[PDB]
Write a protein that binds this DNA or RNA. Structure first.
Length: 122
DNA sequence: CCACTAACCTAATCACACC
DNA sequence: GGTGTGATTAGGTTAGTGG
Protein backbone atom coordinates (compact mmCIF):
# COMPACT_ATOMS: atom_id res chain seq x y z
CA UNK A 1 0.00 0.00 0.00
CA UNK A 2 1.04 3.56 -0.86
CA UNK A 3 0.36 6.79 0.94
CA UNK A 4 -2.90 8.52 0.07
CA UNK A 5 -2.24 10.64 -3.01
CA UNK A 6 -2.55 14.41 -2.74
CA UNK A 7 -4.57 16.74 -4.95
CA UNK A 8 -3.26 20.29 -5.12
CA UNK A 9 -5.45 23.32 -4.65
CA UNK A 10 -5.11 26.05 -7.30
CA UNK A 11 -3.42 28.20 -4.64
CA UNK A 12 -0.86 25.46 -3.99
CA UNK A 13 -0.15 24.66 -7.65
CA UNK A 14 0.53 28.31 -8.44
CA UNK A 15 2.99 28.62 -5.55
CA UNK A 16 4.88 25.49 -6.61
CA UNK A 17 5.22 26.67 -10.17
CA UNK A 18 6.10 30.25 -9.25
CA UNK A 19 8.94 28.97 -7.06
CA UNK A 20 10.07 26.31 -9.55
CA UNK A 21 10.29 28.98 -12.24
CA UNK A 22 12.84 30.91 -10.21
CA UNK A 23 14.80 27.89 -9.03
CA UNK A 24 14.21 24.32 -10.21
CA UNK A 25 16.81 23.08 -7.68
CA UNK A 26 15.78 24.42 -4.26
CA UNK A 27 17.53 23.49 -1.05
CA UNK A 28 15.99 22.27 2.17
CA UNK A 29 15.47 25.85 3.37
CA UNK A 30 13.50 26.90 0.29
CA UNK A 31 11.52 23.65 0.32
CA UNK A 32 10.62 23.96 4.00
CA UNK A 33 9.57 27.61 3.81
CA UNK A 34 7.42 26.91 0.75
CA UNK A 35 5.98 23.77 2.35
CA UNK A 36 4.74 25.62 5.43
CA UNK A 37 3.61 28.61 3.36
CA UNK A 38 1.14 26.40 1.44
CA UNK A 39 0.22 23.73 4.00
CA UNK A 40 1.98 20.72 2.46
CA UNK A 41 4.61 18.47 4.10
CA UNK A 42 8.09 19.14 2.75
CA UNK A 43 8.66 15.54 1.50
CA UNK A 44 5.77 15.91 -0.96
CA UNK A 45 7.15 19.28 -2.07
CA UNK A 46 10.46 17.59 -2.84
CA UNK A 47 8.68 14.78 -4.70
CA UNK A 48 6.92 17.41 -6.81
CA UNK A 49 10.14 19.25 -7.69
CA UNK A 50 11.61 15.93 -8.82
CA UNK A 51 8.48 15.19 -10.86
CA UNK A 52 8.20 18.70 -12.30
CA UNK A 53 11.85 18.61 -13.38
CA UNK A 54 11.18 15.28 -15.08
CA UNK A 55 8.25 16.53 -17.15
CA UNK A 56 10.01 19.83 -17.89
CA UNK A 57 13.22 18.23 -19.18
CA UNK A 58 11.10 15.54 -20.85
CA UNK A 59 9.16 18.23 -22.72
CA UNK A 60 12.22 20.42 -23.34
CA UNK A 61 13.90 17.53 -25.18
CA UNK A 62 10.77 17.12 -27.33
CA UNK A 63 10.24 20.87 -27.87
CA UNK A 64 13.90 21.90 -28.22
CA UNK A 65 23.86 25.58 -5.41
CA UNK A 66 21.55 25.57 -2.37
CA UNK A 67 22.30 23.72 0.83
CA UNK A 68 20.91 20.22 1.22
CA UNK A 69 18.96 18.64 4.05
CA UNK A 70 21.32 18.27 7.00
CA UNK A 71 22.55 14.69 7.35
CA UNK A 72 20.27 12.56 9.51
CA UNK A 73 22.15 10.84 12.32
CA UNK A 74 21.15 7.19 12.71
CA UNK A 75 22.25 5.45 15.89
CA UNK A 76 23.29 1.82 15.89
CA UNK A 77 20.15 1.15 17.93
CA UNK A 78 17.86 2.39 15.15
CA UNK A 79 19.99 0.87 12.38
CA UNK A 80 19.62 -2.58 13.97
CA UNK A 81 15.85 -2.08 14.12
CA UNK A 82 15.75 -0.98 10.47
CA UNK A 83 18.00 -3.88 9.48
CA UNK A 84 15.73 -6.51 11.04
CA UNK A 85 12.70 -5.13 9.20
CA UNK A 86 14.75 -5.03 5.99
CA UNK A 87 15.53 -8.75 6.10
CA UNK A 88 11.81 -9.51 6.40
CA UNK A 89 10.56 -7.11 3.71
CA UNK A 90 12.67 -4.80 1.54
CA UNK A 91 9.69 -2.80 0.18
CA UNK A 92 7.66 -1.73 3.22
CA UNK A 93 4.35 -0.06 2.54
CA UNK A 94 3.51 3.32 4.02
CA UNK A 95 2.01 1.59 7.05
CA UNK A 96 5.23 -0.35 7.68
CA UNK A 97 7.28 2.83 7.21
CA UNK A 98 5.11 4.91 9.55
CA UNK A 99 5.43 1.98 11.96
CA UNK A 100 9.24 1.99 11.85
CA UNK A 101 9.25 5.79 11.94
CA UNK A 102 7.25 5.61 15.17
CA UNK A 103 9.56 3.01 16.71
CA UNK A 104 12.73 4.91 15.76
CA UNK A 105 11.65 8.54 16.15
CA UNK A 106 13.04 9.19 12.67
CA UNK A 107 10.88 10.94 10.05
CA UNK A 108 9.09 8.52 7.74
CA UNK A 109 10.52 10.33 4.71
CA UNK A 110 13.99 9.36 5.93
CA UNK A 111 12.98 5.73 6.49
CA UNK A 112 11.95 5.70 2.82
CA UNK A 113 15.38 6.99 1.77
CA UNK A 114 17.15 4.49 4.05
CA UNK A 115 15.34 1.60 2.34
CA UNK A 116 16.17 3.00 -1.10
CA UNK A 117 19.89 3.16 -0.28
CA UNK A 118 19.87 -0.18 1.51
CA UNK A 119 18.20 -2.00 -1.40
CA UNK A 120 20.67 -0.60 -3.94
CA UNK A 121 23.71 -1.82 -1.98
CA UNK A 122 22.67 -4.88 0.04
C1' DC B 1 -11.77 4.34 -22.20
C1' DC B 2 -7.72 7.15 -21.59
C1' DA B 3 -4.46 11.25 -20.53
C1' DC B 4 -2.12 13.03 -16.73
C1' DT B 5 0.54 12.75 -12.54
C1' DA B 6 1.72 11.79 -7.35
C1' DA B 7 4.05 8.21 -5.56
C1' DC B 8 7.49 5.15 -6.02
C1' DC B 9 11.38 3.08 -8.04
C1' DT B 10 16.58 2.10 -9.82
C1' DA B 11 21.18 3.56 -10.90
C1' DA B 12 24.50 6.82 -10.48
C1' DT B 13 26.42 10.42 -8.08
C1' DC B 14 27.25 14.00 -4.61
C1' DA B 15 28.58 15.18 0.22
C1' DC B 16 30.49 14.53 4.40
C1' DA B 17 32.70 11.92 8.07
C1' DC B 18 36.03 8.79 8.99
C1' DC B 19 40.72 5.92 9.28
C1' DG C 1 42.95 7.10 -1.74
C1' DG C 2 39.26 3.86 0.21
C1' DT C 3 34.67 2.87 2.98
C1' DG C 4 30.32 3.89 4.61
C1' DT C 5 26.03 6.08 4.30
C1' DG C 6 22.61 9.94 4.05
C1' DA C 7 20.77 12.98 0.38
C1' DT C 8 20.02 14.28 -4.53
C1' DT C 9 19.80 13.64 -9.34
C1' DA C 10 17.81 11.76 -14.11
C1' DG C 11 14.47 9.22 -15.62
C1' DG C 12 11.40 5.05 -15.80
C1' DT C 13 7.15 2.60 -13.48
C1' DT C 14 2.87 2.09 -10.65
C1' DA C 15 -1.44 3.35 -9.54
C1' DG C 16 -5.02 7.25 -8.30
C1' DT C 17 -7.53 11.50 -10.67
C1' DG C 18 -10.51 13.06 -13.53
C1' DG C 19 -11.59 14.37 -18.47
Amino acid sequence: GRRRRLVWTPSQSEALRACFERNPYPGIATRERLAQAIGIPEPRVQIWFQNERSRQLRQHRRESPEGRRKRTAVTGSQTALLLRAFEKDRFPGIAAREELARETGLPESRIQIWFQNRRARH
